[PDB]
Design a binder for this molecule. Structure first.
Ligand code: HEM
Ligand SMILES: O[C@@](Cn1cnnn1)(c1ccc(F)cc1F)C(F)(F)c1ccc(-c2ccc(OCC(F)(F)F)cc2)cn1
Length: 449
């Protein structure tokens, strides 16, 4: 009934906060290499943090119920973003229902309009921003704009996109977002109630009231039948809890924020990496192979084109998430003892499973730093870029749609070149990890026939 060994702590209260904050990949690896155990504990803020660094053992982390292993305590930090009693802040039965309602809004049934809607906004953005035959842009920054744009198009009804537009909205997000401090989960007391938080306060409330407005409007056009609007907001209003109740404005607001917040960063980063590797000259063959798959498409693309007819592109995307998972760490609060291989993990520990670590296990992913889209996880379940089990990603399919879609539209109507020797080094200093902002400059060369 014993622990994984604990890495030596040079200074107790810090634990390993420094070498962790500086390069968590190198660090966690060494812990692994020296400890010689995939599974090991580290001290951060004097907090037992046991990382599951063995691909075989993932099922352990993901399979267990929240009651046994709970996200909530860990993920409190979102609550201001999402709201009181929204998602994790909410009781698990409810949070589940909410997540489900959302998940339904993101099934492939809804996707019918999306590919065209997304392609439109990308072509808009390009023409307004890539006006010249050549030119230089920040790829991470542009992609960010393309994502929030194409998303709103995808999940926002006309009227809502009238009162509220993508660029502004992005601004609102970042405003609520700037509020976050990552340290906080492990040490939640730092969250107990913080300067811009008010902005998240105001950022959110502003949004909320806009909607509260929007709703009143759409209620009084059912009489007409004027529009049958089934955008994300639509669905959420038509949802009913089991107990027969409905979602209060706040919960609706929370769930839309959460939806948009997640995709925005995770997706824009994914897009960016993916393009980068492809652009790079070493990756010619892959770039060429990409083409062999999208050259023979009509300019206007449909659903069949993207899911069923771009297997490979999707490989590039997944490989990109494999090499540099946007979310380094997933976590639970061990609320009861759990077996993990030959070890046990004590109620009260903090238990994590790191895509970042796992994606660089050699058994599973030899030479991980190599971006090889045609590589296949050597150990089943190794890849966890979208997590697994109960709490696996719901946005996964929609995201793949957008990134895949964006890749096709951009590359089809453009070429590209990295303004550097080598693909950008990730920047581990952000809550969600993306390539380093300053190096994401590149030259766009238009194409013509
Ligand atoms: C590259 C794109 C994405 C990546 C890499 C990604 C990654 C992940 C990962 C690793 C998890 C596991 C969370 C955990 O175990 O703590 C997860 C969960 C989740 N993701 Fe994503 N995600 C992506 C896109 C999206 C998008 C676009 C949305 C919403 C639009 C979304 C919504 C969620 C939600 C709601 C969960 C919680 C699942 C649950 O707790 O049941 N994701 N995602
Ligand atoms: O899991 C998220 C993020 N996500 C997942 N897919 N897309 N986005 C999430 C959860 C539910 C949602 F509805 C929307 C979300 F975006 C989340 F809850 F907010 C979430 C939880 C924890 C973290 C997170 C936790 C700890 C972190 O520590 C940084 C470190 F790894 F230590 F370097 C960094 C990030 C990020 N996002």
């Amino acid at each position: 009934k014993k622990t994984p060994p604990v890495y030596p702590v040079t200074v107790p209260f810090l634990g390993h906060i420094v070498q962790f904050g500086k390069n968590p990949l190198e660090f966690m690896q060494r812990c692994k290499r020296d400890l010689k155990s995939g599974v090991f504990t580290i001290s951060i803020g004097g907090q037992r943090v046991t990382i599951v660094g063995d691909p075989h053992e993932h099922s352990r982390f993901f399979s267990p119920r929240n009651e046994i292993l709970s996200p909530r305590e860990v993920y409190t930090i979102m609550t201001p973003v999402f709201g009181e009693g929204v998602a994790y802040a909410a009781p698990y039965p409810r949070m589940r229902e909410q997540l489900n309602f959302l998940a339904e809004e993101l099934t492939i049934a809804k996707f019918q309009n999306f590919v065209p809607a997304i392609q439109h906004e990308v072509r808009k953005f390009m023409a307004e921003n890539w006006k010249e035959d050549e030119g230089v842009i920040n790829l991470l920054e542009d992609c960010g704009a393309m994502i929030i744009n194409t998303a709103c198009q995808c999940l926002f009804g006309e009227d809502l996109r009238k009162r509220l537009n993508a660029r502004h909205f992005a601004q609102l997000l970042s405003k609520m977002e700037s509020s976050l401090i990552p340290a906080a989960v492990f040490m939640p007391w730092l969250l107990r109630l913080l300067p811009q938080s008010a902005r998240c306060r105001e950022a959110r409330a502003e949004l909320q009231k806009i909607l509260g407005e929007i709703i009143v409007a759409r209620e009084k056009e059912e009489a007409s039948k004027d529009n049958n609007t089934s955008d994300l907001l639509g669905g959420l209003l038509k949802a009913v809890y089991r107990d027969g109740t409905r979602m209060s404005l706040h919960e609706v607001c929370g769930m839309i924020v959460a939806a948009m917040f997640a995709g925005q960063h995770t997706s824009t980063i994914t897009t960016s990496w993916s393009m980068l590797h492809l652009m790079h000259p070493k990756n010619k063959k892959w770039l060429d192979k990409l083409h062999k798959e999208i050259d023979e498409f009509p300019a206007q693309l449909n659903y069949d084109n993207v899911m069923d007819e771009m297997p490979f592109a999707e490989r590039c995307v997944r490989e990109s998430i494999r090499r540099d998972p946007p979310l380094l760490m997933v976590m639970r609060m061990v609320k009861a003892e759990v077996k993990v291989g030959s070890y046990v993990v004590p109620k009260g520990d903090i238990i994590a499973c790191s895509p970042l670590l796992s994606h660089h296990d050699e058994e599973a992913f030899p030479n991980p730093r190599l971006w090889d889209p045609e590589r296949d996880e050597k150990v089943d379940g190794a890849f966890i870029g979208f997590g697994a089990g109960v709490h696996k990603c719901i946005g996964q399919k929609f995201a793949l749609l957008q990134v895949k879609t964006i890749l096709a539209t951009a590359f089809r109507e453009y070429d590209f070149q990295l303004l550097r020797d080598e693909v950008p080094d990730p920047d581990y200093h952000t809550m969600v990890v993306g390539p380093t902002l300053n190096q994401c400059l590149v030259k766009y060369t238009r194409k013509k026939k």
